[model samples]
Target: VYLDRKLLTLEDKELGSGNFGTVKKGYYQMKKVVKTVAVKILPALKDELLAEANVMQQLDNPYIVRMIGICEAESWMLVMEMAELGPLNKYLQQNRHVKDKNIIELVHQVSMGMKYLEESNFVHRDLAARNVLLVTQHYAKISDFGLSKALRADENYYKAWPVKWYAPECINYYKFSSKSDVWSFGVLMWEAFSYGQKPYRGMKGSEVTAMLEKGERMGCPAGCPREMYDLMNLCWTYDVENRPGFAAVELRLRNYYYDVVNEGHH
Candidate 1:
């Protein structure tokens, strides 16, 4: 909960970078414990940083990344537990040959985390493979709350939105809710099966909007199971009110995983 600032050693290797800033691998030395960590320096308004920090502090889930501490100086810097393997998108690409069951299991893990957030009434406006980190092939955790907002009764205002991940409702009206996060989770499911390919690849924002407005959904990736594809489509349902909640999606994935197992044994 405290950063001795001076005891942190940032490495030259960049772990990841985004609009906020770059994340670097670092080591935090405090008394007897010297732990590897991920550090990010965010140069945003104090209020914004505090809002993000508050959310981070409240989260306690295995599927979500852990925030170790924060340094408040001229700018805000966050220290997080190191995800040994790195981003889930890249991890998936590196191991595309991983069994279908394992891949689906990873997706289920993300959904489980999202379910917790849904129950807590928090909306992760940005849920994608790149925002998910992995400690191993079997362990994935949701990360990057830079765009998350605690749900409000009305439309939530944002300077901008992640076009590729936005739900139809959010893109059109800038209205965000847990349902919007579910929509992004659908995109994340696509990314997982596509080996980290960009959603609506090569299509401009206008084109994606046009396609979605017409109810055209992305096709199932090669080798994706009918059940899993069905789940993905369920998340992308045109009617925001009809889309499944995170718990429901998580349950579907779990049931499908068991079905696959039962079928294979027979």
Candidate 2:
């Protein structure tokens, strides 16, 4: 929304494609920050710029990626905070040896970001670890709301994301809600504990889709706590009324634990 700055010029060799658009690292002489920020440059034109700009403008939470400013030159360049850590999904595969304490803190940060979304009346329809951005050791920030939509009072926004971590009902074409986010959060927790194990291993995408369409769901990881697993399972119930929302999810994650490190045990 704050468009009045000149974005650093980067050649095609320096630019890359993010889910959003042509994003590259850039800096602002005025802000005096040095790490670099993701600059999304869409085509020029006030109407086109305003539409995409709305996405960045509407967003205003510390946890969600913030739009520092924009470049209103030939084209629109929406400047965002830079994250050295790649998309969270890459970390799960790249750093499988992370200690359990680190995993615990990562989940805490994930929830912290979710807390921001939940309170902001947004469901984050896609709440996968892939959407989380790790800023530092055990510290995470939520990113990529390309699929995010603000939730209306008592409204649901499911079925807009993948089925792996999504609830069965969501797979069945039911509307999504914050509760669906809980289901995805549980799957994310499973991934964190299992070193990013793929869900429904050895199952084809079509097969997995069929099962969920028939009212089935993927279960929790072997290392997942029974209470937590049970909670995750309940999130998949065909009945939307059955799943708890973000408040319940925050409570469960805060209270449950994996091997050795007990929840709040430290």
Steric clash pairs (candidate 1): none
Candidate 2 lDDT score relative to the true structure = 0.66
Model 2, 26-87: lDDT tens digits are: 66545454446777777245555565456557766656777776676756677777777756
lDDT of each: 0.84, 0.66
Task: Give the lDDT of residue 196 in candidate 2.
Answer: 68
Please report the TM-score between candidate 1 and the true structure.
Answer: 0.92
For 67-123, candidate 1 gives per-residue lDDT tens digits of 888886545778898999898888888887888888888899999999999887788
Instruction: For candidate 2, give the lDDT of residue 40.
Output: 71
Residue 62's lDDT in candidate 1: 97
RMSD of each: 2.4, 3.8
